[PDB]
């Protein structure tokens, strides 16, 4: 799925792929990829290497290539996120977060049907009206 | 294999030398005096570096053997020329092949 | 060869030597092109351009021989191109306008800046001295000077002959005299070499009053003959084509700064409520809409300016740029004595040619009639071309191009008959546009330009010729079914599109099902990648669908494989190989995301039992020995080598024990996955309850429990210290027993302590401790 | 679920963070969609005239029979592609433009005088003769037959024009049209009506429940309008109304020849046809609304398919009524002995409950 | 489903038999049957229930009969008897009988319909009903049965006039030209001429006759009479490659190659025989490219034969039959231009060689290159 990535991250590992170049399938082998990553900076484990590579030889094309790091690159994604968790609403700083600023949440992203929003307070169980920013969208899954 | 008639004399100092680009003007002729190539109809010098397995063996030995401003005749034998197994459409099998050369630059 | 005017017999053979010599080399024959260079030279084929006393079809055999060898092939590539509009986002991009100045009046169409991506025109010079193997690739180079000279002298003078209307014609006839140079002028308009100056004399040879730049009658006005009148509106109808492509490129350039400016107003109209929510927090709930909605929607309800229902939040100050905008298109459009305009005298032209009299070519009725269709309807143009129409930024410009001429490549090869010298070519040019980053960073680009329906025209041809006398050319079919997933692989809407072609992909499913390492090379694989792990896509398949691959699977069932049993496996009464295959793109269908379809698990289940041979035949149920001893006997086959293999690695031999332990390990799978979900059990659902009963009556529970205890192989030490270790894909898999726990959860499930205790001591614990024994150096 | 909520909110980004050709891109669809496809001009009336014109041609020296104008021309190159013999009817961009052209050009569409009426009639009159004085009434006949029995486009556009030339019970084009397939003993036509008659979509609840869960779970409408049940009802709408212009005005010449055809080899019995479809619509019917009796309330998506229903059915009994009106024995006695008793027993049903 | 005979397995022992097959069949000549009355007079009337009548096989010439052992077995016009070749129409399975009912003078009461009513065959002396095997295309065997299935109904639809003269036409030409090859196998056999009988007058007359029955329409006509005569010409094609017709023109002319020249002919025939050979090899040819011309289907068919009609493309009594045929079928079929090989391609080359300068073979050679829009590179 190429929602994960962005046209401009997959730039980036295009001309790392690039670096061996000769039409993807020369010159890439379980070692020669093991240094690409080198190039990002991320630092895999041994096992993580060839746990990967007997999921998709040696030779590794470039669509394999990118079918096996975008699932696992959707990753440290609460890095950037944890700042937008308090730049939506509620900058007044008493602290109290509002059921009526709530009322944006419901809104139907392809439904437009309405009644479920009040089910939303009732899956919310009232273990100690007030419900933290990052864990309004946590405890329901997982 | 190959042996040539100047038709008009050249300079008879300056020969092709080692690595240097040579630019020809030539006519092919098959043996019963078919045409079957001319840069004149193309209206285009020819240019080809020396020594380097760019053309055949008759005409690299040929336009070694030319001087600077020359016109010479040059018969190639099958053997230094497409072989015995032709020029696939256009030169039929063990064809000795006839080029009117002239060197018009060395470069 | 003027005396062959007298000689009627050898000009008819003459004529027919140079049709061969247009037929060897057609359709881009660029090593038969270099060889007729040979045969008829550039004087050759100038003098006989510029006779006027050649015998008419020798004139009409030398234009067309001209223009197959050396004109023929990059007009083509422009063509197949002409109707798609690549603009690069560029500074000499943004600078065109629709109309040149003030005055709104058309320029000369073609003459201008157009900035959309072309084709290149490469050629090799003809040399048969040279020993090099890259002049066969481009067509023979020509004089494209020279020739542009001599064909507008040639159609200048032509038109001062034809007004006087002489008794001398070149060539004997008006035909002969106009069809084949009008003909090579078009392709020469065509491959865009006239530029400026050469196109503005030629559009007054045209028409001299409309096209005249701010008596003499041109061309349109000549009272030409039929085929000469075809092939004006052939050159009418390029240039509108040259006008549309204007309009769309004007659209582009005022789209960049529009765009700018849109984006500008929304962010600032976001941070306007960013720091203002606290004055109202009811309108910032209204207000925020906008920038929660997808970018494709908040782009449509701000492009709300017409009409007066004027709920988008853009302002006037931006509405009215857009406004003026789109009348200034319509006006260029024609949308609302003298026509003065390329719209008017084409809507006259034509209508005045049908009613001087009868014509009696089909053709020319339809090339007249659909040219005064585009000419009444200018805004049916854009709707048809503005989807075709994508954008890239400059730094894409040269990959985009790179993946054009391979795109072009695979386009030009649709029109040959495939063999060993076109594989290789089709391979590469998809190798090169799965290494072109441009396919993965624009798919919507990719799907405009419909690769994946030429790849599938291809594989059509392919699997046409040689279906029924044994596939030919499975390595084409391999590429071209990879290339295929990788395409649905890429992006929903991708998988979308190539979901509207599973009816063809379930006719031929059978293709290389058989053919070991050929998995994920298959039409059935593609298929099956066309509704993987998309919910709508699964819930829009149809149940006639569905019973293409149930009756396939029980003809696997009741029918040995003739390939098989022809390299020489022992001939039982199905097919374990291809069975799987077929259970596998049920599997996918039935599953989505973790869950099961209700609408196509239920059906699954019904035509699996309406096809009682679609279990294999240890499941039939009459002398079936059941699913344990079944697997069990297969534990017993592949351990003896006269029946597992052919009776003289996995690419060359067929393990007949493996296969039919994952045939038995694939439709268990299969049922389980197609059991109901336990929140509709728990509801009480009567199909669910039914459906349900009916899976767990299909497999006893203790022909699942007796398979999870079947033991394993253990690699083993020998006395040097060698791994010996069986081949996984000979013996009894880890992965075969995945199933019969799934199916056994899903369906008769674990609810009663002293039945878990029993599966745990049975089945678990001696998976668990012949796996924790190989936690070894060696073993691990 | 759990993922449709969370990924989208965060995950997406607004506009103004797109790059300029992404956001360039996505306006060009955009713009498209609402203002180029929204754009309408009419030309049609205007484009006909000019085609119907004979240019100076009785001021031409042609010393010989009268040329046959543009229009005459278009409609000979139509018809005689349709009656050459082909496997199937091709897919034709010019026969869909010209027939959709031709067809607007009959109609140009509080209480309006008599003198307005006879105006508009009038107008009418002399709006469809421009056509079926060229030869347009044998062509829909001759595009219907070669069909084949195969619902697309070309068929499509072929019954609407058809409508067009036929709105008002024309008389003279009912004449031409029985004239025809008399003189052509034409049994493809018959035997293509059937076809599409047997082609005709009806109700579909599977599918209405597959689209129903498919909306609630949030996966997005893929289609503006849900065109998948009752697939296509306008065909279904104009093939049966094309069959009752056959017969307004109690055209009995029509009304006998529609259940029999006695010159021709073969028999189609199109009354009986038509009273097979309506009794398949009733039973579409039943089912959706036996789907919808337990729910108290129907949700605009199942009240418009009961609406894309019920006109299908109003227009099938309207064009049954039109087969029988006057004294039509023959019709009358082979709906007495079909199973129109069937379908009325069951809309009986439905009336007295939905009511 | 339609009663038929089985198709051209090569031997009329086995496609004496009689059974019931679906599809494509409908529209072929051997599914066809003529219901001939057993009155001379008023034999044109309209047929009752009841009214016995024979059943005729058109393109076999056989007649429906019940054999001694219980069995339904086409056999000839030299043996069908009324007592074993009668069968009637009948509605329904009741046992009453029609009884003797006075033979009417004129067109009659219409009674049976095509299609709309439902007959039932039965032999008019054993009267058993004629009823399927039920068991193993299809080949549902057609047998007699006491009483039958209640499945036993069929209907009719009159066959076209076109088609039924097609149909005839078929087995008058098969058998003639079954004749005319046992006579040449005699004569190969060395038969006495006089003995063996050669029909060549009757062979050139029904040469003329087929190829102006394969005249495609001239170019005079209007649009829909030239689109009916195609109709026609396609229909005719159809219906002779149906009924093995192609092939028996091909074995006369493989039979008639073994003689070198006329001369050589002439030895072993007549000279009656002899004058007349030129002419049948060349009308033999242009029946055979006129059976395929414009027929995709005919010239797919004759792919698997084209290999062996280039083989006598050197022949100087030959040469302009099979350059014509091999440029009809190379114009229309794809699927017969991949058998052309470099062989053939050197063979058609050497024709200009050795015979001159002929457009015709420029001609193949273009259909060689280019088909349909689609280039042969190799």
Known sequence: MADQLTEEQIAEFKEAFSLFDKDGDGTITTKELGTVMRSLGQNPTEAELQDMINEVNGTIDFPEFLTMMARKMKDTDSEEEIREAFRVFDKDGNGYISAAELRHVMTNLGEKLTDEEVDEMIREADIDGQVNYEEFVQMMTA | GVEIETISPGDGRTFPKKGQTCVVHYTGMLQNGKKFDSSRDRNKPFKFRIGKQEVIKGFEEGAAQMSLGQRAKLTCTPDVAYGATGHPGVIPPNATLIFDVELLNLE | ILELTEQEELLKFHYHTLRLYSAVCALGNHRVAHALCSHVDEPQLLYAIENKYMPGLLRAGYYDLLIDIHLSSYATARLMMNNEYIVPMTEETKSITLFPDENKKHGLPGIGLSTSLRPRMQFSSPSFVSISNECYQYSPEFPLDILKSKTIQMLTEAVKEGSLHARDPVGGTTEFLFVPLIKLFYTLLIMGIFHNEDLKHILQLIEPSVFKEAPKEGLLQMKLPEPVKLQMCLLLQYLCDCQVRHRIEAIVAFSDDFVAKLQDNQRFRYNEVMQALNMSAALTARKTKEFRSPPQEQINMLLNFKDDKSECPCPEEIRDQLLDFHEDLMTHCGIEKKSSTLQQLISETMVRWAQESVIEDPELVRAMFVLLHRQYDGIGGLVRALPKTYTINGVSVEDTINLLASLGQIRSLLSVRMGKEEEKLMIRGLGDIMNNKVFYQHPNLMRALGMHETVMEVMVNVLGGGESKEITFPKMVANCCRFLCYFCRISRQNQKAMFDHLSYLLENSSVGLASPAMRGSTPLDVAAASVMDNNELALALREPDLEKVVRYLAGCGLQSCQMLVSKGYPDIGWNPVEGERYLDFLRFAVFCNGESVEENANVVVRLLIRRPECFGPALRGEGGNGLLAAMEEAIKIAEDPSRDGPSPEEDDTIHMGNAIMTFYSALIDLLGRCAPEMHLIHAGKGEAIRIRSILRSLIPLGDLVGVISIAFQMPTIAKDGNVVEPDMSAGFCPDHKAAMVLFLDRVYGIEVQDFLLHLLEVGFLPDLRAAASLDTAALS | ?355 | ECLTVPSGEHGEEQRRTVHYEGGAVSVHARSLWRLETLRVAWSGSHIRWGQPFRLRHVTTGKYLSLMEDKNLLLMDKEKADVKSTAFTFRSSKEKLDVGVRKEVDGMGTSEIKYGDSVCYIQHVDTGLWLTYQSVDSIQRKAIMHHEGHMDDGISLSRSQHEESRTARVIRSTVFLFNRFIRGLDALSKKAKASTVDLPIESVSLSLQDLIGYFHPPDEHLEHEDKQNRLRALKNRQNLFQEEGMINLVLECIDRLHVYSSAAHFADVAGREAGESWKSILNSLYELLAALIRGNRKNCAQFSGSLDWLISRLERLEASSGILEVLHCVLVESPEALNIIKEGHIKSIISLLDKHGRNHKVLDVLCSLCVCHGVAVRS
């Not at chain 4, 009336?45 to 029979?65: C, F, N, S, V, Y």
């Not at chain 4, 017969?247 to 010159?263: I, K």
């Not at chain 4, 009796?293 to 009994?317: H, L, M, P, T, W």
Request: aromatic letters at 10%; proline letters at 2%.
């Open chain 4, 1 to 355: 679920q759990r993922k449709r909520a969370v990924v989208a909110c965060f995950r997406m980004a607004p506009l103004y963070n797109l790059p300029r050709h992404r956001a360039v891109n996505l306006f060009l669809q955009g713009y498209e969609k609402s203002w180029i496809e929204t754009e309408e001009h009419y030309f049609e009336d205007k484009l006909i005239e000019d085609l119907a014109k004979p240019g100076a041609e009785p001021p031409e020296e042609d010393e010989g029979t009268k040329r046959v104008d543009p229009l005459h021309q278009l409609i000979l190159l139509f018809s005689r592609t349709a009656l050459t013999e082909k496997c199937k009817l091709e897919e034709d961009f010019l026969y869909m433009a010209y027939a959709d052209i031709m067809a607007k050009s009959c109609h140009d569409e509080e209480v309006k005088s008599f003198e307005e009426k006879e105006m508009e009639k009038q107008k009418l009159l002399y709006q469809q003769a421009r056509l079926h004085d060229r030869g347009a009434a044998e062509m829909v006949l001759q595009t219907i037959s070669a069909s084949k029995g195969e619902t697309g486009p070309m068929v499509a556009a072929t019954l609407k024009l058809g409508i067009a030339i036929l709105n008002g019970g024309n008389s003279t084009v009912q004449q031409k049209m029985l004239d025809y397939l008399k003189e052509k003993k034409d049994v493809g036509f018959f035997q293509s009506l059937a076809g599409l008659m047997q082609s005709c979509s009806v109700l579909d609840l599977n599918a209405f429940e597959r689209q129903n869960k498919a909306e609630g779970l949030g996966m997005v409408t893929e289609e503006g309008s849900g065109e998948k049940v009752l697939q296509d009802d306008e065909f279904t709408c104009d093939l049966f109304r094309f069959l009752q212009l056959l017969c307004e005005g109690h055209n009995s010449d029509f009304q006998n020849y529609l259940r029999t055809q006695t010159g021709n080899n073969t028999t189609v019995n199109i009354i009986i046809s038509t009273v097979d479809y309506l009794l398949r619509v009733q039973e579409s019917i039943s089912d959706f609304y036996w789907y919808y009796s337990g729910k108290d309330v129907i949700d605009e998506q199942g009240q418009r398919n009961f609406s894309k229903a019920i006109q299908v059915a109003k227009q099938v009994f309207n064009t049954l009524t039109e087969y029988i009106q006057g004294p039509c024995t023959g019709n009358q006695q082979s709906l007495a002995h079909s199973r129109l008793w069937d379908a009325v027993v069951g809309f009986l049903h439905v009336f007295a409950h939905m009511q």
